[PDB]
Specification:
The structure is a homodimer of 207-residue chains. Chain A is globular and about 50 Å long. In chain A, strands 2-1-3-4 form a 4-stranded mixed sheet. Chain A has 2 domains: 98 residues, Glutaredoxin (3-Layer(aba) Sandwich), CATH 3.40.30.10; 109 residues, Glutathione S-transferase Yfyf (Class Pi), Chain A, domain 2. The first copy, chain A, is α+β, with helices and mostly antiparallel strands and 207 residues long. At the A-B interface, strand 4, helix 3, helix 4 and helix 5 of A face strand 4, helix 3, helix 4 and helix 5 of B. It is classed as transferase. The entry lists the keywords Glutathione Transferase, thioredoxin, conserved residues, hydrophobic core, transferase. The assembly is dimeric. The entry is titled "Crystal Structure Analysis of L23A mutant of human GST A1-1". Chains A, B are Glutathione S-transferase A1.
């Protein structure tokens, strides 16, 4: 078959969690960077973007836009979405929480300086009182190596992706959560993830 | 019977009310009225991220809108036949949610920004979203968005068409197929029942 093709800017943005997930799944893919406005216009004009926006991933005859659509399909194809419907609910619950926190951090740079030193305080407070304790609690509930069904899933990947960004913001934030640390160590040590974390992978830098 | 915990309002629960009801599911609701109605669910451990919507369903307490919806869509055979169908469904409904979201928080928009944000929402409706969906209907000529059969995508799009009608009734005017769909979907027994006075269908907010 043809290798999936990822169309985005040569940046993290809204395409990174897809890069992490496909790499974690050991899926080989090609990137096509948008590097000019005219490049993006090429895409619209050719009819490649349903809602005129990227990320778009070409995969299995499809031109999938919308991060959640692209990720849902990849997680499913490569068996990282639970073994049943109830497992998918826990997974969706977890990863939607991660997306919410993700979202905040993603857009934190593109706001005013006036709204900034409170939005940061508000992010850090939610990490430490809402988000991190909830994932710790889940890992403590079962004592197992993965978040769901004692098997690696997209929740592990997306959370560990998130714990990497949380590190860049403030490395002290995980410090009271030992099981999250252990998870971040365990997942970074999986062969595919470890390859992704190595220099030269498709992992992107911060802005 | 599933139990919706939300405020007595549309909010982030309404699209679940539509979907439950389209699928012939009787649910109960439990309305939060005070900040200490909310505060009870948090300390009771009922909310994973201390937030509503929450649905009690099949022994789970599911939070996050997308988790609830995905679960209900699959359980009631409204999520397509396979992963490729779901992907087209996901692509479509995430587009819908993106527009839904802009419309959902128009009321809470800073008042000096409201004029531009409203004007931008209409531009997107007219140029981005409504044509994408007209083009889909026109490409297969079939009565439903996906798989020649009822899916959550038809339900979510129709719901949106009603919020767009409340905003500006001219917007749908040159989208014949969107018009045709809104009509056919609103005459499905369960939906017609939902649109009738005295259902769990919630009003627009006003203050």
């Amino acid at each position: 078959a043809e290798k999936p093709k990822l169309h985005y800017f040569n940046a993290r943005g809204r395409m990174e969690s897809t890069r992490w997930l496909a790499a974690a799944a050991g899926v080989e893919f090609e990137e096509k960077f948008i590097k000019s406005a005219e490049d993006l216009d090429k895409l619209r004009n050719d009819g490649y973007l349903m809602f005129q926006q990227v990320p778009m991933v070409e995969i299995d005859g499809m031109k999938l836009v919308q991060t959640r659509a692209i990720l849902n399909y990849i997680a499913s194809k490569y068996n990282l979405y639970g073994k049943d419907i109830k497992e998918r609910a826990l997974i969706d619950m977890y990863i939607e929480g991660i997306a919410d926190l993700g979202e905040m951090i993603l857009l934190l740079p593109v706001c005013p300086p006036e709204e900034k030193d409170a939005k940061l305080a508000l992010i850090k407070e939610k990490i430490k009182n809402r988000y991190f304790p909830a994932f710790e609690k889940v890992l403590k509930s079962h004592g197992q190596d993965y978040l769901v069904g004692n098997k690696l899933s997209r929740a592990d990947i997306h959370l560990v992706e998130l714990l990497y960004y949380v590190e860049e913001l403030d490395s002290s934030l995980i410090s009271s959560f030992p099981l999250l640390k252990a998870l971040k160590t365990r997942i970074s040590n999986l062969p595919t993830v470890k390859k992704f974390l190595q220099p030269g992978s498709p992992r992107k830098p911060p802005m």
